[PDB]
Enzyme design. Sequence first.
Site, PDB file in Angstrom:
ATOM      1  N   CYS B   1      13.823  -4.818  38.506  1.00  0.00           N
ATOM      2  CA  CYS B   1      12.770  -4.448  38.841  1.00  0.00           C
ATOM      3  C   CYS B   1      11.692  -3.566  37.802  1.00  0.00           C
ATOM      4  CB  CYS B   1      12.943  -3.234  40.051  1.00  0.00           C
ATOM      5  SG  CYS B   1      14.065  -3.852  41.486  1.00  0.00           S
ATOM      6  N   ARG B  15       4.653  -3.134  41.576  1.00  0.00           N
ATOM      7  CA  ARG B  15       6.072  -3.329  41.356  1.00  0.00           C
ATOM      8  C   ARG B  15       6.278  -4.736  41.088  1.00  0.00           C
ATOM      9  NH1 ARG B  15       9.868  -2.238  44.956  1.00  0.00           N
ATOM     10  NH2 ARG B  15      11.490  -2.415  43.623  1.00  0.00           N
ATOM     11  N   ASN B  78      16.537  -0.795  42.142  1.00  0.00           N
ATOM     12  CA  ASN B  78      17.995  -0.596  42.061  1.00  0.00           C
ATOM     13  C   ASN B  78      18.290   0.451  41.147  1.00  0.00           C
ATOM     14  OD1 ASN B  78      20.365  -1.678  42.813  1.00  0.00           O
ATOM     15  ND2 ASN B  78      20.367  -3.149  41.262  1.00  0.00           N
TER      16      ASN B  78
HETATM   17  C1  LIG Z   1      17.892  -5.626  45.979  1.00  0.00           C
HETATM   18  C2  LIG Z   1      16.695  -5.027  45.553  1.00  0.00           C
HETATM   19  C3  LIG Z   1      16.690  -4.519  44.162  1.00  0.00           C
HETATM   20  C4  LIG Z   1      17.033  -5.482  43.186  1.00  0.00           C
HETATM   21  C5  LIG Z   1      18.310  -5.945  42.701  1.00  0.00           C
HETATM   22  O1  LIG Z   1      19.411  -5.406  43.130  1.00  0.00           O
HETATM   23  N1  LIG Z   1      18.298  -6.766  41.568  1.00  0.00           N
HETATM   24  C6  LIG Z   1      19.461  -7.114  40.978  1.00  0.00           C
HETATM   25  C7  LIG Z   1      19.717  -6.009  39.776  1.00  0.00           C
HETATM   26  O2  LIG Z   1      18.507  -5.638  39.253  1.00  0.00           O
HETATM   27  O3  LIG Z   1      20.616  -5.961  39.400  1.00  0.00           O
HETATM   28  C8  LIG Z   1      16.314  -3.672  46.610  1.00  0.00           C
HETATM   29  C9  LIG Z   1      15.139  -2.723  46.380  1.00  0.00           C
HETATM   30  C10 LIG Z   1      14.524  -2.437  47.645  1.00  0.00           C
HETATM   31  C11 LIG Z   1      15.901  -2.574  48.707  1.00  0.00           C
HETATM   32  C12 LIG Z   1      15.662  -2.862  50.194  1.00  0.00           C
HETATM   33  C13 LIG Z   1      14.955  -1.365  50.693  1.00  0.00           C
HETATM   34  O4  LIG Z   1      15.517  -0.248  50.264  1.00  0.00           O
HETATM   35  C14 LIG Z   1      15.000  -1.721  52.305  1.00  0.00           C
HETATM   36  C15 LIG Z   1      16.270  -1.605  52.774  1.00  0.00           C
HETATM   37  C16 LIG Z   1      17.162  -0.190  52.604  1.00  0.00           C
HETATM   38  C17 LIG Z   1      18.572  -0.461  53.299  1.00  0.00           C
HETATM   39  O5  LIG Z   1      19.436   0.884  53.112  1.00  0.00           O
HETATM   40  C18 LIG Z   1      19.116  -1.478  52.903  1.00  0.00           C
HETATM   41  C19 LIG Z   1      18.490  -2.664  53.054  1.00  0.00           C
HETATM   42  C20 LIG Z   1      17.145  -2.869  52.555  1.00  0.00           C
HETATM   43  C21 LIG Z   1      16.314  -4.418  53.061  1.00  0.00           C
HETATM   44  C22 LIG Z   1      17.185  -2.850  50.855  1.00  0.00           C
HETATM   45  C23 LIG Z   1      17.854  -4.140  50.213  1.00  0.00           C
HETATM   46  C24 LIG Z   1      17.705  -4.293  48.845  1.00  0.00           C
HETATM   47  O6  LIG Z   1      18.521  -3.173  48.315  1.00  0.00           O
HETATM   48  C25 LIG Z   1      16.436  -3.888  48.306  1.00  0.00           C
HETATM   49  C26 LIG Z   1      15.728  -5.214  48.366  1.00  0.00           C
END
Ligand SMILES: C[C@H](CCC(=O)NCC(=O)O)[C@H]1CC[C@H]2[C@@H]3[C@H](O)C[C@@H]4C[C@H](O)CC[C@]4(C)[C@H]3C[C@H](O)[C@]12C
Lengths: 321, 318, 320, 318
Positions: B1, B15, B78
């Site tokens: 990100c 973003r 993340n």
């Molecule tokens: C997965 C991405 C981050 C990118 C990532 O992990 N890439 C690999 C890397 O960079 O290593 C995050 C950013 C926002 C997150 C979401 C939001 O916080 C909203 C919500 C929050 C909940 O606690 C868990 C589910 C989720 C849908 C989350 C899932 C997931 O946690 C997301 C969509």
Amino acid sequence: CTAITLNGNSNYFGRNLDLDFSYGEEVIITPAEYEFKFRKEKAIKNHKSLIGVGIVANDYPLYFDAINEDGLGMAGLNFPGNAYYSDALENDKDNITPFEFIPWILGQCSDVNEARNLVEKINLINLSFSEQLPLAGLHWLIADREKSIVVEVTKSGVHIYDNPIGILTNNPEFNYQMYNLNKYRNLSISTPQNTFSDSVDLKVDGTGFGGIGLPGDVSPESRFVRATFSKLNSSKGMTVEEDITQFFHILGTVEQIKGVNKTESGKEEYTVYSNCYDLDNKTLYYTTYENRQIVAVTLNGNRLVTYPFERKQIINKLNLE
Amino acid sequence: CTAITLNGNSNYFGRNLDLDFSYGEEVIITPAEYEFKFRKEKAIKNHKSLIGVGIVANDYPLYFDAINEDGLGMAGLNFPGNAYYSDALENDKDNITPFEFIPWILGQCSDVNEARNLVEKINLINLSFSEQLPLAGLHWLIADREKSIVVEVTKSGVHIYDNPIGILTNNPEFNYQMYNLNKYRNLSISTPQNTFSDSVDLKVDGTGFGGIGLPGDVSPESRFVRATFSKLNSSKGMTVEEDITQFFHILGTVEQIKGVNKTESGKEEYTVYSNCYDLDNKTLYYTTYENRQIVAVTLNGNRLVTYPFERKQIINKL
Amino acid sequence: CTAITLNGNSNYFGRNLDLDFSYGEEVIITPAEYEFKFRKEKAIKNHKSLIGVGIVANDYPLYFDAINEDGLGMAGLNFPGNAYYSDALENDKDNITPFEFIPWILGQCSDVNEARNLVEKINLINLSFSEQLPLAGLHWLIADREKSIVVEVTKSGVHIYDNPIGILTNNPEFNYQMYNLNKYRNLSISTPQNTFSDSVDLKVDGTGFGGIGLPGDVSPESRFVRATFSKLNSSKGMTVEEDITQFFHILGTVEQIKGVNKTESGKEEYTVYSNCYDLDNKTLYYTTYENRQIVAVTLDKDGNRLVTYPFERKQIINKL
Amino acid sequence: CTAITLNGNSNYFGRNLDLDFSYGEEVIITPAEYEFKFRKEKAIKNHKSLIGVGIVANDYPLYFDAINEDGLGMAGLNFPGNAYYSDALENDKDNITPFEFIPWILGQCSDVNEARNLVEKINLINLSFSEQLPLAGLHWLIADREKSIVVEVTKSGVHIYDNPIGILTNNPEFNYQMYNLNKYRNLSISTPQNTFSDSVDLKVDGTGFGGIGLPGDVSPESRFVRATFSKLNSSKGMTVEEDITQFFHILGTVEQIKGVNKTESGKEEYTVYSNCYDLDNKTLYYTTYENRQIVAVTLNGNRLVTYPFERKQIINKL
Ligand SMILES: C[C@H](CCC(=O)NCC(=O)O)[C@H]1CC[C@H]2[C@@H]3[C@H](O)C[C@@H]4C[C@H](O)CC[C@]4(C)[C@H]3C[C@H](O)[C@]12C
Ligand SMILES: C[C@H](CCC(=O)NCC(=O)O)[C@H]1CC[C@H]2[C@@H]3[C@H](O)C[C@@H]4C[C@H](O)CC[C@]4(C)[C@H]3C[C@H](O)[C@]12C
Ligand SMILES: C[C@H](CCC(=O)NCC(=O)O)[C@H]1CC[C@H]2[C@@H]3[C@H](O)C[C@@H]4C[C@H](O)CC[C@]4(C)[C@H]3C[C@H](O)[C@]12C
Ligand SMILES: C[C@H](CCC(=O)NCC(=O)O)[C@H]1CC[C@H]2[C@@H]3[C@H](O)C[C@@H]4C[C@H](O)CC[C@]4(C)[C@H]3C[C@H](O)[C@]12C
């Protein structure tokens, strides 16, 4: 400038045009019976049809890049100081200007082997289009659905290179650009092992560590390495449409944004346009600095047919105000 | 990100979301009178309205990023392994889940000073949304039209930093990302002088030599440096449309294409979507990996309003 | 291998020899009346006397590097795959083997001009010294008190380059080594200005920031760049002793320590020896991996027998 | 500055002193019953003997670095702006000046565990030796035959780090230097495989390609990375002599030659001296910029015994 090829569900060829201003670029279709006039050779009244990007001046199609009805492509990229055009006419060779070179090849050649035989025998002459539009040094990528070559005409003569990666930028000369890749052999698409020393516990706290060392600047050698890495490792698409989408992503990795590259004049070098030709389907797709939406024109007369570029952001607005 | 701000004719925040798959994310508008429930705090029946991007699960807006009606924005990025959420409630703190954090701040605060005041009283607690959506480690960018802060909650506590450049990526911690810029002081937008030695004739055969040493890969620290260089040097536009165009070019400089970043699982990390919020006009602009053409929705009941993303390339055929 | 020149209070020429193993190399003086026999040319019974480093085999001096009594220097450096030696005699040329090349030039030439005129008429021929000692791919640095040239004999012929910096390593070819310097123009010996952006307050917390971007590995191109940077920016000495001191510091910047460069055999490539020839004073100075103390020997120049001094390969420590 | 440890046939500790002038450094032996006076603590009449390098002022040994009779070593390295000395005395701590620090530890401690115990109750006070020798910011490597710690006393207090690699330079702080190694995990001592792409035939025309990426400059962070790579990969010797030779080759990899590093004063920063202490045999070995020949002195009284450094090149003329 960056020019690439891609082999997927179809076969593609395209480029970023990188410059500190716009010429008012447009789509130019040259039909079969548009008479090609040459400063120092006989007119050709019947030839292959072209589609490409450039400008029209004095009713002449000044191609930046193009393809023909057989899916052969050719692109001129900036090659300052290295290009050498002859001040002498040859009695036993076709005396062709640089601005005539794309018509001469794409007008007559159906594939890279025919292009190569014609290029081998050319005399590229040092004759400008006009006072308004003077010559600047170029080199060329020529590509078909199977392979590509690089043409560099220098003081040591006409050099034709097999291009094993389908990548081209600017200086230096192609053997130097290819040699430059050798020191990047250690780069990877995945988290590497700790070869530094198993006596220290090196930690990985994110993805993408395998690319560390890939240059990120917009110098021509940096763009040649970054485009090569991005192109050769890009994921296969399921459809032609996914390929085109993927092609614009690859050109994006070496795009020049306004402000990061200031020329001698103090103007900002930027990616004026990006394009992707589907060679098998003879279709041009393009974007501009000002407009993200891809625009498509297909190649299907003795007059040029032109479509000027939209230089405004075409946004899909879901609601007003 | 990668999350950035930009000050131009209006003021922007946005973003890239980089992941190996799409969550089926969409535009979510949360109106003033949608009731925000919290696991350990009193419900908020009346609050600022939100527009952002995320998923709706059990009628609850799980925002990846969002702005409110005042032009305050907040993005979760993340932060694997560094994020620490407490198992213990604190009676002298607001006890808030990470997934409640965007609603808690954007529902209640009009600007960054108000956000900082509320963050200073927060205790991010270790309760997941559900068995199917467990907590992952995050850090946040909070931005208004004037400035931005970074919020990192770690073992050593709740850290808030002034963000002097309006940039954030992933690990490491913000003081390390900022310190990492110092070794790039020599980079330039222009052809440099030969300082290597006056005794050798070094030649320049192309433009862009000033940038040599800028990192090109998609590691979080490389993207932090490249985003910062691209954003701080980007030419001023003459209109809001030129600014939005420029914003998407900046996010493009740190985009992840499919194939160059293969995760532990063997899946390809990619820029799932890119967005730009116009904070002053309260308008969301976005693109997806599959569709280059920017989509816009302006923030103008008590039920969530959604607009699904179209993941098809919209081509203008002449 | 890295070979350099330096112009100071005197004028110097010298090299690191980087190999997986010692070859038993030693100091060899070849006196004026030692008979030089050539496979395909007339013997030379009277010639310039030589001091250099190499091995003796069948009473023949196989030099790695050497100078003559006029302060003309020549070094052979590894150039695997690019070196091309002719399988045929060539018509209007001296036909000379690679192992004869240093005797051929340094025996007959007093300066680089003369060396160049002789190399222009040369054909390097594919004859080995012996079965136990087959030909390896080499290129050469030739230097006097004023200037230096590089000689690369490849598929495309005998190439002579003016060497404007007095640096040579291994592959690639000299025009590639020189072009490769261009991307390093931004390096500096002093703290640079923040040109990154004056919108961010970048801090400097130590010295040496100007160098960031200089390559540190022991690949031949990295050693070319780092030797060039170190040599061109090295402070001027006040005495010949200070110059010699500096010369060994300069070679030290591109030394290979045992362990960082592992060959295909599993053996580590390392700097077997470092030398500095004072061209004006016809004195060889050298160090070895095993012994830090500089050893000096001066050009034994009359007579007809090779004279040799073996390397001290023990650490000679001043115990107070 | 660069300080390293090495484990082989014996066990070693030593450093490069990098500066833009010489103080007239010498070997200083402090016997067991030279009385250590402290500005704010009780004198030590009987203590461990010391051998080290520094200068003597007012009959006081100002050590740059030293070992004691138990093979415990300590070196002070430049740490500008980060070092913070207290303007307060603490009743529950030993109030020790930076210039007393080496005598305080090496005088009383037989190993690093003991050093750590004493440092955990130290207060480094803001009190200069004299008007002509003012305090400059330092941090310290403390090393024995088994392990080493780093002491950094900063605005946030007295930090003690286990040093898993036995390397120290200058700024930044130790966690930053260790973190900075992580992006070099891909470096190798052997020719790497072509992981760039299968679809291009990349050629190797020399040895050393595995190290491409290693920084070559003399910034403190570049020296830390380079010294670490050089030391962790250095070949084992079969003798103590071969270990000492290797040790001087490792320090040589991060040596500063006159001309490549100009201080803000416009003077040339250079490696004034390099040393290697055999901790098990209690022997000091050293070289100077001006003399390549290694000099040895063994630790075998109420009085300092001192030997000036020879700054002439001692050449063997056959
Ligand atoms: C997965 C991405 C981050 C990118 C990532 O992990 N890439 C690999 C890397 O960079 O290593 C995050 C950013 C926002 C997150 C979401 C939001 O916080 C909203 C919500 C929050 C909940 O606690 C868990 C589910 C989720 C849908 C989350 C899932 C997931 O946690 C997301 C969509
Ligand atoms: C982007 C570069 C710019 C080259 C340049 O001017 N560089 C000078 C320099 O860098 O020193 C090239 C690519 C295609 C070129 C054009 C095409 O060849 C068509 C046409 C050819 C005519 O000979 C000169 C005008 C021009 C419009 C060319 C202008 C310009 O030559 C272009 C657009
Ligand atoms: C074998 C090495 C090449 C380095 C190398 O690649 N080895 C590591 C490896 O094999 O991994 C070369 C370097 C200098 C050479 C010598 C010099 O050129 C002088 C002389 C030249 C004669 O043509 C062949 C014999 C020899 C003694 C040569 C023997 C041998 O040919 C040497 C010592
Ligand atoms: C300045 C150098 C380190 C090199 C340096 O500063 N690099 C140059 C640079 O990077 O600019 C340090 C290391 C040991 C220090 C000395 C020792 O601690 C002993 C003694 C301590 C006294 O408190 C102040 C004077 C001094 C002689 C100190 C002077 C000076 O404080 C020294 C000699």
